[PDB]
């Protein structure tokens, strides 16, 4: 029968690791760096395009950075239309919450759902992974500002400071490096870009080959706000810092 | 949850030393009027059994086929289908049975009530009663509907009980069968003149007969019967 | 349905598949469980090549499945929350029908059954998980610790290892525990826990996480600094 | 790979001949059967000198009047037994009386072939069903994953199994007394056992028509245990 | 609307004795004024010296006997043809009445036969499947009329010891199966007169050790 | 060799493989005979037992009472085919008030084995069926096979060395049909031609297995005691 | 019988290639070459008429297709693939859209819609991925018009311009020298024109090319009139005619 | 009917009447009223017969269940709860019963537990049920102290199934009384009414309006 093209997308191997997941995370290793900073006024989302054409649509464009709610936002590394799968589900289910409990969804609470997600398609229903590796950025009144990323696996962590896709272990040293506890968002924009700009396969770093967003209480008293970065507004911060 | 529409009304019968004979009208009442009349409530099973079906009409046409299916499922595969694996009435009569009250417990029954006549093939005589409700009896003499309150009164002065059977022959018991045919046709306001009668013996086999007449009727006291009481003219 | 027969029998008689996902087990963060006269003390192992984490929001190692009872564990991370996760809604469901918390070793039991029954169904792996789960029954102050495993077997321990290097910590404490003495007070329980994951760990800062659990739902976690000050403790009369 | 339920060029389905070769590598059950009653006793074989040997359950009660030992993956047989309570207990509530040892062995082994591509596999662990009821008086079963079952005056499954039926064949008799048979149980047990035997790493039991299916106390099985060194020292 | 349900009228009887148990019968059946057949059997011999008879909706009292016949078959079958108990027959026999709750099979059901100690059982049920044993029952159309009688002559309520002031009751003892005999033809032709849809025959199975006997008696045909 | 590993397989002369290994698996199993006369059907068994501590596996079930078979291969696909056949001659009963002829018993197990070796996922039934039977056309004997195939017999016999039986009931032919009226005649005869098979071992009280159905006959079973007459 | 590929049949080698969705790119570059250009007051898209034979009827067969009245689209790649993207992209815009909204869906919406169908052939059991490539050209009043690329793995992007299939490589280089954010429509339609000669060999004409564009409100082409709001769809399809007459001032 | 169960210093005392009625017609005078769940558990029948008999037998089978997989004998509210719990899954459909839950644990000690048709679940110390219960209430509640002795308890409920047994035309024929204890129920006796009555008339002095 069918037996004989079932490639057993959900067993172990002789060393107790999952094929599917690990060739999943090998192929994100290929994708575009992107890079989450959290900071104690503020989250920083940065990300690089892959390898732009002169003649892509840059203004009209989203590729790496998502809006899951106006508390909570997600960086992307992997099979775009995975993500997307993933990000629409992602927006229903805070939905959901904010419908039964009349609040909005925890940061945890919906990373983790999602992450029960991904680990169902490594257990049981023989299909293929998502390759897609996320990292949240969001806000909650318990925890404050959160950053944590999810990978193929279905596992998930939180963090200070944390990049996925590729070059995540040249930026990890260089996070690892300049990253102090006390520091703001404006500080953080600038680790963030200068890391990208050193770990990037480019030539040099330009408007056009950049996402980037930030999570800020910089509205008018205790609320968040969420800055989805223009084409102009990423030139000019890129200007700020020196970079070109 | 059903009602019935295109009906037929009583069928009698009863067994006699060698067999079995049954008897129904050929009509098929609409209400009051009297809709059909070459409907024929007597369905031969092979050479050995009739079923007498009465009530509702449409449903008698679905048990027709499953008895003519019946037949046809019994000879696949079976070289005795002609001989000691043939059909016969107490396996056919089951069979309905089983049908009637399984419709009957689903809330949905075939609106008839059902006599299947025949000769086993022993020689012993079959005749069983079974109706919408899936209740089932045997007896000497049956009957349905009007018959059941004016036939078998009739026919139990024949065969009043077991013994009275060997005692009675073919002519006696076809006798007391045609004059219950007329009685009904005086008294049940949806019976009709025409209907058939089988007989099924253990010598003789099947016998059908098709458009026999009731006759020899009385109505000729009718002309002095004058007014309801004071009348004279 | 993804019908496919993953969990089979070898010709040697082995089930490939759930060895695989001992394997699994093997590669996880070590966690151990060490039970005194009056208490239980969970310790768990946490790697340090992760610099930059948040500790505040990160999964902690040690899950309270109800306010009597905790679990930990060894393996795949993922795979852990789908367990607990069923452990917290069985924990609710027992109060709800027979009007009393789980037993640990019902709790236990449930945890185990469910491990099994991805090891012979259609369609499914196994997980890739063992438990240390520890406790005290409903109105008990008998100290319980049990640990289960891929296949779905689970036993009672006095003090058991599980993870990476669980066999060089099972070699400590097989000699260091005593059971007609077991550790006194809480204050000896922990350093003993303390003591057998030093033997693996590396250094005693933000690796170590110990949890102690006391009848009567009365569980607490140890901060970085009163985890320090029993590293501090230990390497000062391990010079001698 | 190759199917699930396929047969071997021989005659036999891989699966279930696989299972056997896992039950082998299990700790050895024992049980005898005589007049007085029936014992069932098994190695509890624990893995390390911390795990509490008391938590090791390998033999199990299916009602009062049927016990049963296992040998193998003993994970396997948790839905085994559970099947068996309810089979045992719904019987009693259908017909308000005790079921046969025979019926529930069958109804056990009624699991074992659904399986295929129904569960996944067949069981990787062998029962040793004892029982009593009024028709057929006291019962010993072998129920194993191919859907078989055996009864047996006695009967050894696990590790040791092929040294420990050999003795069997030579020390059971028709007449034997149930204190007999408990110290046969103990003397085969401790020839095939790696680890010295003792109470804490064997366990004894047995079903009786008065007292029903009792489980041994590590305090009374020791006594048995020196009770049986007594008697072999002294010829 | 239509309706399911329907009554076929008649009665029966069951009586136990010390070694032995009848379970009677009247071979009537009828519909509303209407006499359907004077012999049509309601008293069924169901194996292992079980009678059994369920009277009241004909179409469900065949069911039933038909299923619980067939259980005893498979009884056989799945137990090494173990003889079935008067006992576990009754309990049985209330999963197949309760098996139907909320739909039921409109019959009084009755069963007779020797208890494992050899002594005479009678069990009855609603309906529905409550059961209970008893020395004595009558159930059917007839049973208000006849049920009375048999706690006087069977179970000698409200009998006492003559010049004993009322004092001390008349003792209880088991009936020779003649005596049982006469109490139940005297039952059935008491019950003909006074109740329409009762006569025509009566027909008796008595169960002892040695197996199941039958007798028969022409009843009133009014 | 690669067209075995499923029934679902055809090789390229035209062979089921998987059907075939089924086959085999009645060829291992214990030797069981069967024949009849024109008023009685006889089914014979040598049954078999692990060890000398071990029971005999039971080779002989009822599925009405006038219909019953012997088994040889995997007894648990006995247990699904005969429960398969009591619902069936059951069905017969109930509904038609008549009992199952023996030719319709073996159509339907025929069937019911065909489907199991055309689809994937299942697999053919491993075991070989000897169904006696007394009908409205008289004494019956039918092998039933798992690739589907169900002969009518005047005697057979199937499991290891089944040749031997086989052939001495072909010599035997003219004398045992005419056993009319003589139940303890035709089992000695059914007696005799298991004793065709045997190897070593000899028939012994426990051993035997016996049963017997016909006119004025149940089907039932004889065993223990009640076989010591035939020895 | 039945289903019984209910596993995925597109699976990560250990390189981390999705290697079904690589081959089904494979098959949109063999793909006849199909383009877009976006301009200032619309979009236009074009594609070669490859006739399988002269003796059929290549009217008859539409690469250039209607989805909604302000959206379009044409492909490379596998045909059959892309006829029943179609049929199920015009399903979803009514499903999904307009029977919930009363109005059609603007263009990056679909194209959504469309990817996700891609996407789960990607990833769903017993089945194999789209062999095309899409290009979407649209209007929707709050977006203005737009070009959207749709690939096999269900990725999509927005382009100013933009070319797929067999000589796409050299009429993207093409493109980026004409094109500029200044373009109207009619200069757009005449670039598509020119990139598309160089990847033609045979006859180049009217009957042997296919072009659309999202343009400006067609009101004679809308059936009916009495409503002011409705005012006919900016998808039009050029004729023949019109394609040749370009052509002469080329 | 008529049914009771009160919690005292010796346990608890169960008692019911005998009679079962379809109508005015009295169907049975020797019907039993009280359900043997376990050798530790007791079961009081007042509404739908098959029901309760059917559903208290099936309690019984779901606590050995439990004893056998938990090692341990079940809780009076566990038991009461997976009756409550199930009756309540056939709400609506027409269940018929009022029943008392009664057992003696060592961690509960002895408890009673009023088990509804309707899903009604009570914990109490005193519960009487049927069309008679108005009248044994009437003698509970004037008799009942906590400090009773076993001797006393026992009467206390047979003499209040009597005065039920006479008032209400749907109670009688015998009283069946249960005491329970932690090591198990002990039965005390069928009593039936017709001479309970007199008995109870003589010696007590009670019952004037009777002539006897
Ligand atoms: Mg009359
Ligand atoms: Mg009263």
Redesign the interface.
Known sequence: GSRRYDSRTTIFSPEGRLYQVEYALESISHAGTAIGIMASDGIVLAAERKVTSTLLEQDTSTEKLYKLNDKIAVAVAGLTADAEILINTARIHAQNYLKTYNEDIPVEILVRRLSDIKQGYTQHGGLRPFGVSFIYAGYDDRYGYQLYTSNPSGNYTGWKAISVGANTSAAQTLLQMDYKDDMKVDDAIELALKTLSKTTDSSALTYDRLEFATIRKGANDGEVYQKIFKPQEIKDILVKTGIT | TQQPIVTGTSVISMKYDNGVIIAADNLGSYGSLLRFNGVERLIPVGDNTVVGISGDISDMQHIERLLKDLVTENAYDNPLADAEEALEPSYIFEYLATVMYQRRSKMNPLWNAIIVAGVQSNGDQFLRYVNLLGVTYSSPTLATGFGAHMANPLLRKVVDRESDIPKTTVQVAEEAIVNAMRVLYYRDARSSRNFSLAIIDKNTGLTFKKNLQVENMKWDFAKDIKGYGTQKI | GYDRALSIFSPDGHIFQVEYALEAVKRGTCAVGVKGKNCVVLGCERRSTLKLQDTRITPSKVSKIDSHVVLSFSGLNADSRILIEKARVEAQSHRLTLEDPVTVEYLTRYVAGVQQRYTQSGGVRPFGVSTLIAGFDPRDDEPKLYQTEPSGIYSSWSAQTIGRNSKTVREFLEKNYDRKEPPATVEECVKLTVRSLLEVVQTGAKNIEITVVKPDSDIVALSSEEINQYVTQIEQEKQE | ?????????????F?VE????????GSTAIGIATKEGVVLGVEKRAT?????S???EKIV???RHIGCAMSG????A??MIEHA??AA??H??????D??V??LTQSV?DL??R???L??????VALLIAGHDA?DGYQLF?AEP???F??????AIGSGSEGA?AE??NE?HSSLTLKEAELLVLKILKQVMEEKLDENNAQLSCITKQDGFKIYDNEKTAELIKELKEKEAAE | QFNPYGDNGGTILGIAGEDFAVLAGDTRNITDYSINSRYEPKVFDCGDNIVMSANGFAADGDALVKRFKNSVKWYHFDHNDKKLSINSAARNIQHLLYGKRFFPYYVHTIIAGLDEDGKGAVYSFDPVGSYEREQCRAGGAAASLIMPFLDNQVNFKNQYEPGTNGKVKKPLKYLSVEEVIKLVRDSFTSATERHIQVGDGLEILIVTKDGVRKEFYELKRD | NNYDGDTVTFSPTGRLFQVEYALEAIKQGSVTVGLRSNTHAVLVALKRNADELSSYQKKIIKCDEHMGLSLAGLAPDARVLSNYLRQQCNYSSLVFNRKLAVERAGHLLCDKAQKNTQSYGGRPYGVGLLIIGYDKSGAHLLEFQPSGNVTELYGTAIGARSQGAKTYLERTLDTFIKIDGNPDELIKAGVEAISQSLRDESLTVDNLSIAIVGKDTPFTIYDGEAVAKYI | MTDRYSFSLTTFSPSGKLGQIDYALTAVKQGVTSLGIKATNGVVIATEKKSSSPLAMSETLSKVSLLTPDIGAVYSGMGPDYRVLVDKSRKVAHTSYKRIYGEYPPTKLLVSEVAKIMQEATQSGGVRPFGVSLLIAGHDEFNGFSLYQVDPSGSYFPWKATAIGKGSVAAKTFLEKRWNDELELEDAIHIALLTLKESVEGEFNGDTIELAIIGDENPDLLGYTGIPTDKGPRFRKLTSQEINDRLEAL | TTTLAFRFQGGIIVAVDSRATAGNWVASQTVKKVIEINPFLLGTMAGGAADFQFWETWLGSQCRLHELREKERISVAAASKILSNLVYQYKGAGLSMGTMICGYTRKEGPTIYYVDSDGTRLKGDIFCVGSGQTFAYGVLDSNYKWDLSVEDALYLGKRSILAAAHRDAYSGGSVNLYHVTEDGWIYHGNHDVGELFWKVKEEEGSFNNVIG
């Open positions: 790979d190759r199917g699930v339920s396929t047969f071997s060029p021989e005659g036999r389905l699966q696989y299972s056997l070769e896992a039950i082998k590598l390390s000198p911390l795990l509490e008391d938590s090791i009660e299916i009602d993956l003993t994970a396997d948790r839905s309570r309810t207990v719904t009693n509530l259908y017909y308000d009386e079921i046969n025979e019926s082994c074992a072939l399986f295929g591509e569960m996944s596999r067949p069981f990787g028709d072998h191919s859907g078989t055996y009864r047996y005056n006695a009967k039926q069997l064949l059971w």
